Design a protein around this ligand. Structure first.
Ligand code: POV
Ligand code: POV
Ligand code: CLR
Ligand code: CLR
Lengths: 196, 196
């Protein structure tokens, strides 16, 4: 493994991306992948097993955990990464297909599809940011929550596992997503300006 | 303690009661008291502590026990004995009061009050028999009961303590109560016949 191969793999074979989406976006993507890898198994490993409520009612822990955590942060970020990386994979596959068909026997089409893929990537980033805002208002996570879902009688106190570490990693991931959004907007603006 | 004193105490100082209510009713009353004494603490001692249901729901045992045993057989029989013995106590106290007031200074009044007390005793016996029939239809007691009272989810299986011994003692007490009813009716009929 060399740098001239890793850089080519990350950037794809596309020849229209500038240094914003070729040197900086790949680094932020690697940063997000590494943070998700080092945080998924350890911090969020025992989010449900150590989630306890102050009650004797059977089945209250599971219903309260599902009520307060419809989908954990780790899985939300994994889905966000997959959806954000899908258009880049599509562009790389399209470039490879065009190269194959021209070998066995265009610039504007590649430029347009790259612009469309960057727009879709920005849209996915914004959609996942909005979903995270809807599900979990506020970056901070609290230690104690009040759960009144059936079958729990009245309201019970349930305790979250590692609120502070999860808050730190949430801040990191949200900052990375914001940087990605800014870089995508800058890339779109730069391409439009240079094309005109 | 001699027999001529125990007999006088049981019969009271009333001079209108015949041999039915003076030799037989007192013996049946003693029999009921002895059976209740030997059965109350032992058979019904752990009726609630050993009453268990097949569920993890807290508080289901207590609500199911209260649902199926609104008032235990021992307490029902104790209340029945007290209420049945109340008119005899009233008659004895009235006889003592009349003796005291005649000493410090009638037969028809004593005859009428004795007849009324026997009628009230029969009425109390019948009322308690009907109450026992309403609360617990059938002499037999079952081992397993189906309880669907809140907070128990759906229907749970609850297990009664000593069904067979309680059935035996229920049969004994019901037979004694029936004998008491028959003797009271016979006493009333005999008094009415002899008075006319
Ligand atoms: C997302 C998770 C990240 C975790 C943190 C990772 C951080 C650290 C991880 C990785 C850092 C890199 C480690 C190896 C570097 C040596 C490369 C090398 O010598 O290449 C040379 C030889 O090599 C080859 O020909 C084969 C290259 C295999 C490299 C390892 C493959 C993946 C290992 C997966 C491991 C799985 C377990 C990992 C954990 C699950 C290049 O070939 P060459 O013939 O010299 O080139 C031509 C010669 N010429 C130039 C003179 C003309
Ligand atoms: C409902 C529960 C029932 C349970 C089953 C019971 C079955 C067995 C129970 C009881 C059977 C009787 C036992 C004692 C019998 C002896 C009587 C006697 O000798 O009398 C004589 C003396 O006696 C007295 O002067 C005093 C009498 C006291 C008797 C006991 C009082 C209550 C005990 C309560 C115990 C509490 C513990 C019990 C359990 C909680 C009579 O007096 P006298 O001077 O001879 O008379 C005149 C003389 N002359 C005739 C020559 C002219
Ligand atoms: C500018 C940034 C966003 C570019 C990022 C490039 C990403 C989307 C590309 C570069 C290399 C790609 C990987 C290359 C090889 C494989 C192995 C295959 O069996 C599953 C997909 C997987 C794991 C690809 C996933 C997408 C991937 C990680
Ligand atoms: C013909 C049958 C029904 C007659 C039965 C007589 C009954 C009702 C009488 C006879 C002796 C009585 C007892 C004599 C003395 C006492 C002690 C007193 O502190 C409480 C009441 C108590 C315990 C009496 C309760 C009623 C009693 C048991």
């Amino acid at each position: 493994m060399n740098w001239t191969g890793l850089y080519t793999l990350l950037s794809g074979v596309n020849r229209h991306s500038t240094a914003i989406g070729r040197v900086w976006l790949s680094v932020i993507f690697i940063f997000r992948i590494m943070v998700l890898v080092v945080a998924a198994e350890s911090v969020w490993g025992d989010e449900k097993s150590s989630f306890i409520c102050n009650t004797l009612q059977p089945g209250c822990n599971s219903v309260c955990y599902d009520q307060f955590f419809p989908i954990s942060h780790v899985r939300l970020w994994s889905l966000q990464l997959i959806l954000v990386s899908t258009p880049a994979l599509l562009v790389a596959m399209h470039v490879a297909h065009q190269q194959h068909i021209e070998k066995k026997m265009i610039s504007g089409t590649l430029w347009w599809t790259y612009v469309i893929s960057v727009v879709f990537r920005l849209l996915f980033e914004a959609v996942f940011m909005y979903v995270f805002y809807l599900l979990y208002p506020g970056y901070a996570m609290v230690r104690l929550v009040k759960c009144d879902v059936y079958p729990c009688p009245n309201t019970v106190d349930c305790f979250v596992s590692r609120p502070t570490e999860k808050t730190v990693f949430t801040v990191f991931m949200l900052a990375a997503s914001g940087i990605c959004i800014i870089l995508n907007v800058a890339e779109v603006v730069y391409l439009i300006i240079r094309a005109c």
